Amino acid sequence: SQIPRLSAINDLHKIWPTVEEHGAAIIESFLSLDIVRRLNEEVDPFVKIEPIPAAKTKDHPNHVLSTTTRLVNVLAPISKAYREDVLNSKVLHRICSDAFHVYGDYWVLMGAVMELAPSNPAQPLHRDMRFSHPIVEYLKPDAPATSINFLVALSPFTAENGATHVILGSHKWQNLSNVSMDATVRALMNPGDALLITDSTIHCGGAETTGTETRRLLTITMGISQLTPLESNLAVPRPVIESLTPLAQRLLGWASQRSAAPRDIGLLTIRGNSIEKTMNLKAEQPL
Ligand SMILES: CN1C(=O)c2ccccc2NC(=O)[C@@]12O[C@H]2c1ccccc1
Ligand SMILES: [Fe+3]
Secondary structure, eight states: OOEEEEEETHHHHHHHHHHHHEEEEETTTOOOHHHHHHHHHHHHHHHOOOOOOOTTTOSSSSSSSSSSSSEEEOOTTOOHIIIITTOOOOOHHHHHHOOOHHHHHHHHEEEEEEEETOOOOOOBBBBBTTTTTTTGGOTTTTTTEEEEEEEEEEEOOOOOOOOOOOEEEGGSSSOOOOOSSOOOOEEBTTTTTTEEETOOOOOEEOOOOOOSOOOOOOEEEEETTSSSSSSOTTSSOOOTTTTTHHHHHHHTTTOBBBBBBTTTTOBBOBTTTOOHHHHTOOOOOOO
């Protein structure tokens, strides 16, 4: 059984139900080729100057990613396509509101570009969030997923160049005895396609075998606003923040948040008022 593939336009209402059942789905043409081009252009130089994940110069080194991975997060200050087109994706927001309605508001836990050098080895099969949010492991096994991960191809995903592996149905597994590469299928994707998984879906980046292709992706981890993001936008210039939509501002932690509790008292509030009301935060102001 292969990963179900869905149209971002026509099959919109089926995307989250598909992931909820099978643990993965491919959203064909999630981002247009044009958004992909612009995003690639914008992040290019920052990918190039990015050192190894556990570089000695970092005070939060990432010891888990391979030395042949480059990860660049906090994309808003770096990319117009990201902070405008991506953060406002209608497809993304329908899926996220489908997925997280039982909990309340959601935001970006991390939006990162990942680039894999030629001959990058495959990752060990894993679930996300275990190196940042121990709390997730203590949730009841049937609790609705508290984060999901959009893995957006920014270049072709082939079997040959290390397209992602997923184990369909593994988001519901409790006993991990059958975890093996034998159980996986591949996410073959064109640029702009997206693989959508939950935080319980067992998956791994694939082994790059050509020795010449450089595979790149945009990973967008969306999570309930009750969970702390992996990345901070606190240092993003106010002019940039005030160029965004109110929705994009909330996704980046520049607005208060709400839970779904009937008499919700809110998150990140200030003596009963919102961040944005308190700071008189403007929105949609061109730079
Ligand atoms: C270390 N890590 C990440 O840096 C990461 C990167 C992008 C998006 C999410 C993310 N979160 C993770 O939990 C984790 O896929 C995890 C993983 C496990 C094993 C091997 C490689 C990665
Ligand atoms: Fe992962």
